[PDB]
Design an enzyme around this catalytic site. Structure first.
Site, PDB file in Angstrom:
ATOM      1  N   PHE A  60       0.827  -1.198   0.000  1.00  0.00           N
ATOM      2  CA  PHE A  60       0.000   0.000   0.000  1.00  0.00           C
ATOM      3  C   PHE A  60       0.862   1.249   0.000  1.00  0.00           C
ATOM      4  CE2 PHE A  60      -4.406  -1.552   0.669  1.00  0.00           C
ATOM      5  CZ  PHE A  60      -4.113  -2.900   0.730  1.00  0.00           C
ATOM      6  N   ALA A  61       0.576   2.151  -0.935  1.00  0.00           N
ATOM      7  CA  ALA A  61       1.325   3.395  -1.072  1.00  0.00           C
ATOM      8  C   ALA A  61       0.315   4.526  -1.210  1.00  0.00           C
ATOM      9  CB  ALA A  61       2.260   3.336  -2.266  1.00  0.00           C
ATOM     10  N   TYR A  65       3.366   8.436   0.784  1.00  0.00           N
ATOM     11  CA  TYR A  65       4.116   7.180   0.776  1.00  0.00           C
ATOM     12  C   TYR A  65       4.375   6.641  -0.627  1.00  0.00           C
ATOM     13  CZ  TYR A  65       4.065   6.744   5.856  1.00  0.00           C
ATOM     14  OH  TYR A  65       4.276   6.942   7.202  1.00  0.00           O
ATOM     15  N   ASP A 150       5.019  -3.529   4.102  1.00  0.00           N
ATOM     16  CA  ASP A 150       4.998  -2.076   4.097  1.00  0.00           C
ATOM     17  C   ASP A 150       5.901  -1.518   3.000  1.00  0.00           C
ATOM     18  OD1 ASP A 150       3.315  -2.195   6.293  1.00  0.00           O
ATOM     19  OD2 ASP A 150       4.696  -1.144   7.641  1.00  0.00           O
ATOM     20  N   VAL A 151       5.569  -0.322   2.512  1.00  0.00           N
ATOM     21  CA  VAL A 151       6.302   0.279   1.398  1.00  0.00           C
ATOM     22  C   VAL A 151       7.558   1.062   1.793  1.00  0.00           C
ATOM     23  CG1 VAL A 151       5.018   2.481   1.262  1.00  0.00           C
ATOM     24  CG2 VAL A 151       5.963   1.423  -0.845  1.00  0.00           C
ATOM     25  N   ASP A 152       7.604   1.572   3.024  1.00  0.00           N
ATOM     26  CA  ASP A 152       8.690   2.451   3.452  1.00  0.00           C
ATOM     27  C   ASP A 152       9.904   1.635   3.864  1.00  0.00           C
ATOM     28  OD1 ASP A 152       7.221   1.522   5.700  1.00  0.00           O
ATOM     29  OD2 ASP A 152       7.651   3.329   6.838  1.00  0.00           O
ATOM     30  N   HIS A 172       9.012  -9.154  15.282  1.00  0.00           N
ATOM     31  CA  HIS A 172       9.234  -7.711  15.310  1.00  0.00           C
ATOM     32  C   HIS A 172      10.662  -7.437  15.791  1.00  0.00           C
ATOM     33  CE1 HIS A 172       7.323  -3.580  16.127  1.00  0.00           C
ATOM     34  NE2 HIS A 172       8.605  -3.446  16.419  1.00  0.00           N
ATOM     35  N   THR A 184       3.859  -5.253  23.502  1.00  0.00           N
ATOM     36  CA  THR A 184       2.804  -4.252  23.387  1.00  0.00           C
ATOM     37  C   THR A 184       1.536  -4.814  22.721  1.00  0.00           C
ATOM     38  OG1 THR A 184       3.720  -3.347  21.330  1.00  0.00           O
ATOM     39  CG2 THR A 184       4.477  -2.371  23.380  1.00  0.00           C
ATOM     40  N   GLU A 242      -1.900  -4.409  13.540  1.00  0.00           N
ATOM     41  CA  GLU A 242      -0.836  -5.229  14.116  1.00  0.00           C
ATOM     42  C   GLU A 242      -1.286  -5.910  15.396  1.00  0.00           C
ATOM     43  OE1 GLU A 242       3.064  -3.701  16.194  1.00  0.00           O
ATOM     44  OE2 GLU A 242       3.506  -4.265  14.107  1.00  0.00           O
TER      45      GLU A 242
END
EC number: 2.4.1.40
Length: 284
Positions: A60-61, A65, A150-152, A172, A184, A242
């Site tokens: 997803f962008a 992003y 993720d794109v980043d 993670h 978390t 998440e």
């Protein structure tokens, strides 16, 4: 039906020597945890090529992003499932802003415009909804496995068929050495994503999960439904999808777990000795 592997010459696995002694390489439900040194990529490439495996990669962008797509895609070309059939699915609000990236043979890219949604609630649920509610028939027809990232990010090293399995999550990078009470997870019993302090195997990151199309659709459907319930109950999980991914993978054990080689942030966390490779990393 699976044909015979051809003759191959490779080092004999030795029963009385582990590949890795510094890390856990199998979960208590007998799922491999994928670290460098645990797999022979030549054997795996043979197995998956003999099945003519196609891997879909969703990304997803949205808004700003889109600027991350060029490096994401160019590095994926260098490092992601090279030699195998790959179909990228780029979900974006700006189809014209998708960079024209040159692809290797047997690889294709589709630009999928999304969607509407002028309220943050639907934005939070967008990804899980998109994978499960709208692209269902297309994915089943076009690919064998789906990988959701993720794109980043950028690929720096090999990310290949060693990850493929009916259902996987990724450790993670911030919490692989943490005790479960410190995870978390969502801790409010009012949320569908709730996990008590005495439960939990691992903390998985929302930035890299996948599996067979069927299992990914099951996961994304369940997470979307759970998020809708939370919205109706006026609650938003602490870490959004998440938190729900973590709840799902607690109750539906993944059949492989990827080590943090597969999701790392070097600026934040450096390069520990336990990581022989940094494969897929946050862009600073």
């Amino acid at each position: 039906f699976m044909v015979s592997l051809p003759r191959m010459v490779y080092p004999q696995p030795k029963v009385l020597t582990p590949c890795r002694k510094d890390v856990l390489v199998v979960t208590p439900w007998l799922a491999p945890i994928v670290w460098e040194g645990t797999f022979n990529i030549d054997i795996l490439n043979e197995q998956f090529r003999l099945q003519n495996t196609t891997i879909g990669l969703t990304v997803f962008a949205i808004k700003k992003y889109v600027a991350f797509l060029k490096l994401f895609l160019e590095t994926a070309e260098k490092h992601f499932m090279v030699g195998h059939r790959v179909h990228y699915y780029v979900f974006t609000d700006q189809p014209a802003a998708v960079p024209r990236v040159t692809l290797g043979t047997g690889r294709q890219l589709s630009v999928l415009e999304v969607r509407a949604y002028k309220r943050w609630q639907d934005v939070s649920m967008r990804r899980m909804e998109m994978i499960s509610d709208f692209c269902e028939r297309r994915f089943l027809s076009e690919v064998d496995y789906l990988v959701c990232v993720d794109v980043d990010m950028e690929f720096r090293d090999h990310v290949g068929v060693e990850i493929l399995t009916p259902l996987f999550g990724t450790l993670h990078p911030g919490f692989y050495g943490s005790s479960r009470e410190a995870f978390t997870y969502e801790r409010r019993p009012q949320s569908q994503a709730y996990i008590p302090k005495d439960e939990g195997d691992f903390y998985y990151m929302g930035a890299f999960f996948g599996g067979s199309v069927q299992e990914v659709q099951r996961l994304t459907r369940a997470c979307h439904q759970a998020m809708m319930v939370d919205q109706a109950n006026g609650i938003e999980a602490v870490w959004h999808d998440e938190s729900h991914l973590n709840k799902y993978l607690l109750r539906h054990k993944p059949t492989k777990v990827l080590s943090p080689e597969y999701l790392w942030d070097q600026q934040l966390l450096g390069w520990p000795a336990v990581l022989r490779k940094l494969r897929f990393t946050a862009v600073p």
